[PDB]
Design a protein that fits this description.
heterodimer, A: 396 residues, mainly alpha, 2 domains, 0% strand, B: 121 residues, seven-stranded mixed β-sheet, four-stranded antiparallel β-sheet, binds a molecule of 2 linked components (YIO-GAL), binds nonyl beta-D-glucopyranoside, LacY/RafB_perm_fam (chain A)
């Protein structure tokens, strides 16, 4: 495997960079874009979360099936790119305006667009670039690394211009979409090893898919709902609130750089240890961050606990693909990824963010993070025995 | 959602101390960083002091940076403002406020604090 003169490592490494630059404007700062610029209810954000969740649930199963049926022809990435070129006009001239007139129909329009391009589109891109990673002899983690930077780079640009011009970032995101098209243009890309839908749906009957989904629902989904309200919990440690955000801003921007660095070596790390132990290590880092937040009391301790995310992501993202390709027929890589790690997480996410949200109000943040911390730690150790692989003690 | 009831205000002479309190009703007090604001007639509302949920960090305005002390008791869900060596300039309505993100998203009705110029030059 080579990287410097690997044309497609750069075309798709960059593709990760600019794609996640685009989504960086949308996702990490979505709550402030809604409440601060469009003056939207929090009554209504639950309607937006529901719309995206509902259309994501529909898109992600088909994205996986089409991803495998298409294999590497990359016809769907051409489609996603075309929709991201409207990133700016959609947010500025469609989503915002429509939601202020009537929120419910802005949520269907936004639920469809965002559920397509990001909630399902990002896993679909990752799944495709992983296939390319096997053909063009470069590790998937080394190309995904780029996305961490593009995500961080965009987080920096929006913080600087928040005071100046809020629309600038969205227009750049559209420009990034045309960068993606150019890269997609120049990226280079009777058989019963090919994808067949009939046998794709018999994946449900196998039990290692169920226990993989159990890990996703029990660990990854619990962790993702913990991170949804962690931003406000982070700033509550700061008396100033303006420095609470700016410290938050600094940790996300430069923390993502550490994420990329850990992910540079994560393929080599994960190749020697199991793909299973990569997930259990990821689940272990997940659980420690959650539980640690309930006992945290200090501004420093949560800067640490927010930096822990950067250690977890590389072993969960690189590890999950190593686990899927190792223990399932790799013609079903994308199907397995977008059904187990996306659809089931997104389905569980609906029910456990109401259970998470309802505990924040009954008991404290600390008590709430203690509960989820044990659900995540419990299902992480259940899967020390349940997932299929070497295991932790093989290394002693 | 959250109810804040300020208490302890009044009228005092220049140079004396006065402690104010704020009753936190509703959602968990521990989940919110809080601050005190004041509003005098013919002047803009200003933040006097803020404090995180635990009490580990406190920020005071330079106008009262040395005199006032902001306290909280999350077991008793109350938020205090000790005010020492008060001056007639410090005469205003003092408000209790809860912070979510950067926005202070809940307020109390406020308690009036009046300081006399008599008895101190
Ligand atoms: O959450 C939406 C998508 O997030 C990534 S994981 C996410 O990736 C960005 C870019 O690299 C940042 O580093 C974040 O720190 C990290 O949490 C998933 O791979 C996607 O499938 C979506 O799930
Ligand atoms: C914007 C982020 C830039 C990241 C650049 C990634 C550099 C990866 C370098 O890998 C190395 O490349 C050599 C030539 O291909 C190989 O001989 C060698 O085996 C491999 O270790
Ligand atoms: C703020 C708008 C509402 C957003 C809803 C958030 C649900 C996002 C689910 O993302 C999932 O995260 C995993 C990373 O661990 C990926 O593996 C998986 O493929 C991806 O589908
Ligand atoms: C996809 C994310 C949707 C968020 C849904 C919120 C569910 C319950 C809201 O609890 C809220 O928790 C905040 C902590 O930040 C408090 O500040 C706020 O007073 C409180 O009302
Ligand atoms: C890598 C980041 C480490 C986080 C440690 C936070 C240290 C405290 C910095 O906070 C600010 O300090 C000011 C005084 O210096 C206070 O007046 C203000 O209230 C407070 O908001």
């Amino acid at each position: 495997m080579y990287y410097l003169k690997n044309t497609n490592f750069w075309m798709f490494g960059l593709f990760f960079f600019f794609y996640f630059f685009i989504m960086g404007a949308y996702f990490p700062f979505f709550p402030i874009w809604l409440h601060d610029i469009n003056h939207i209810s929090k009554s209504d954000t639950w309607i937006i979360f529901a719309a995206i969740s509902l259309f994501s649930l529909l898109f992600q199963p088909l994205f996986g099936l089409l991803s495998d049926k298409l294999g590497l022809r990359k016809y769907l990435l051409w489609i996603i790119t075309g929709m991201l070129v409207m990133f700016a006009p959609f947010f500025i001239f469609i989503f915002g305006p429509l939601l202020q007139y009537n929120i419910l129909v802005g949520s269907i329009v936004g639920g469809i667009y965002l559920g397509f391009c990001f909630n399902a589109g990002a896993p679909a891109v990752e799944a495709f670039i992983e296939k390319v990673s096997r053909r063009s002899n470069f590790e998937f983690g080394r190309a995904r690394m780029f996305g961490c930077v593009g995500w961080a780079l965009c987080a920096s640009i929006v913080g600087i211009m928040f005071t100046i011009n809020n629309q600038f970032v969205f227009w750049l995101g559209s420009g990034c979409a045309l960068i993606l098209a150019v890269l997609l243009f120049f990226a280079k890309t009777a058989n019963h090893s090919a994808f067949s839908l009939k046998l794709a749906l018999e994946l449900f009957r196998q039990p290692k898919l169920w226990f993989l989904s159990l890990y996703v629902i029990g660990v990854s989904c619990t962790y993702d709902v913990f991170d949804q309200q962690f931003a406000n919990f982070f700033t509550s440690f700061f008396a100033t609130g303006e420095q609470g955000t700016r410290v938050f801003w600094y940790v996300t921007t430069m923390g993502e750089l550490l994420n990329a660095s850990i992910m540079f070596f994560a393929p080599l790390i994960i190749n020697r240890i199991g793909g299973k132990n990569a997930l259990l290590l990821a689940g272990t880092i997940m659980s420690v961050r959650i539980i640690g937040s309930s006992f945290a009391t200090s501004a420093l301790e949560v800067v640490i606990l927010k930096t822990l995310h950067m250690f977890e992501v590389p072993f969960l993202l690189v590890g999950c693909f190593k686990y899927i390709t190792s223990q399932f027929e790799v013609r079903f890589s994308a199907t397995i990824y977008l059904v187990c790690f996306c659809f089931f997480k997104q389905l569980a996410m609906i029910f456990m963010s109401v259970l998470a949200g309802n505990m924040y109000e009954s008991i404290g943040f600390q008590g709430a993070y203690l509960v989820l911390g044990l659900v995540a730690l419990g299902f992480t150790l259940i899967s020390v025995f349940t997932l299929s692989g070497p295991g932790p003690l093989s290394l002693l | 959602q959250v109810q804040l009831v300020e208490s302890g205000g009044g009228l005092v002479q220049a140079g004396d101390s006065l402690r104010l309190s704020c009753a936190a009703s509703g959602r968990p007090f521990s989940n919110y960083a809080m601050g005190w604001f004041r509003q005098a007639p013919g002047k803009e509302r200003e933040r006097v002091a803020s404090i995180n949920w635990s009490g580990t960090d406190t920020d005071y305005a330079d106008s009262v940076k040395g005199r006032f002390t902001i306290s909280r008791d999350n077991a008793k869900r109350t938020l205090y403002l000790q005010m020492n060596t008060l001056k007639p300039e410090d005469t205003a309505v003092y408000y209790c406020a809860a912070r979510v993100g950067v926005d202070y998203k809940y307020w109390g009705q406020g308690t009036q604090v009046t300081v006399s110029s008599h008895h101190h030059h």
